[PDB]
Design a binder for this molecule. Sequence first.
Ligand SMILES: C[C@H]1CC[C@@H](C(=O)O)CN1C(=O)c1ccc2c(c1)OCC(=O)N2
Length: 167
Amino acid sequence: VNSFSGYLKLTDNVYIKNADIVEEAKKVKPTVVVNAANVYLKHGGGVAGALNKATNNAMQVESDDYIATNGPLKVGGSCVLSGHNLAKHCLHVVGPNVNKGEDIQLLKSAYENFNQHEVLLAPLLSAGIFGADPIHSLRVCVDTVRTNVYLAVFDKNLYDKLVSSFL
Ligand SMILES: C[C@H]1CC[C@@H](C(=O)O)CN1C(=O)c1ccc2c(c1)OCC(=O)N2
């Protein structure tokens, strides 16, 4: 039993809700919140911009030190950093950005990072400003993640379309 509330159950391990991931994280304080990161951990907009803003830019400060030490992530890769005031940890995961021409096949590799954590609060990878089809992203999530994932979909219309179109 965990403290996630109001989710619809899609499969044995995947759950979904129309919610703002920032507000969900502040309420639940999950062990792991997933960020929709880019390889430079430049948290400018979308999910990343919103999560970073909620940390008063502390996420960006920590991320800049990480990059200065380690260099950029790989598309499809991840790193674990602090969750600041939102969660114990933040798993920064880089899905492919279609608006940059990146290979959508890397979306499965991106979701594989979730399997290293027993329970996660997460957005749909490569959705939103990353340009991929969110229905496809949900299909990849369900077919790749085996650990318990609680998906927050900000847009009510998309959520309804995601639920209503789920096979
Ligand atoms: C992954 C993408 C595309 C699908 C969106 C959806 O789930 O409807 C969620 N996404 C966001 O980038 C996004 C999420 C939360 C916030 C935000 C942007 O900005 C303002 C804010 O306070 N929160």
